[PDB]
Amino acid sequence: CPLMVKVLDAVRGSPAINVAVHVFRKAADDTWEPFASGKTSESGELHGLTTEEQFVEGIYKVEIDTKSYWKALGISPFHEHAEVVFTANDSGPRRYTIAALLSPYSYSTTAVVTN
Template sequence: MDKASILVLLSSALVFCQGAPVDHGGSDSHCPLTVKILDAVKGIPAGNVALKVSRKGTNGTWEKISSGTTDIAGEVHEIITEQDFTPGVYRVEFDTKNYWKAEGRAPFHEVADVVFEAHAEGHRHYTLALLLSPFSYTTTAVVVKAHD
């Protein structure tokens, strides 16, 4: 993939992440972790993508703490509570294979993983954006100070 295509994909992910909020019965200011997925092939939100959230334990193993599925807007809100979203290393695993199979495509990746350290600089709220295609994925994050 050439540099121009990569820049377009990254720009699209940023724009997607900053898009107009969808009414999901609450405010993202109260969601410590929000996930948004865009299907780069069709240029629309990727609905019905299963995902799970795990936290790395002190012994190095991953403990599943939550799971969900993206809605029609390609989003998952309130996947974890403030109380459960403690400082540590987290992994969000997206089931990209089953999404693409349902779209009639044979994908390269089984899953897309995003691993990150939460709250290293104090309490924050995180929005993870995933730009998805059958042979690649790009992620970006918007990290903001939590509202009091």
């Protein structure tokens, strides 16, 4: 699993379940083309987005639909969504864990990169 996403809820102190995640890869013409998508599980995690064969070097954008998540809880959020943009595998294959911590008017995202 070369690309994993984990989302936590800072208001309830629990994993953010059923959060939609869309991943994009920047194409030759500087356009963001769909790459993979999914929803976080009961543990707030999303695995199996891609394979090492398909996850080649490039610039990727991970979009986390935070807005839908908060509205489903009756809270009015500030952000439309949380975005994480990074260059990946620029120097060989790496395993990426994108973690996000969510609050209505704030979020933090961290990346853990391992071999």
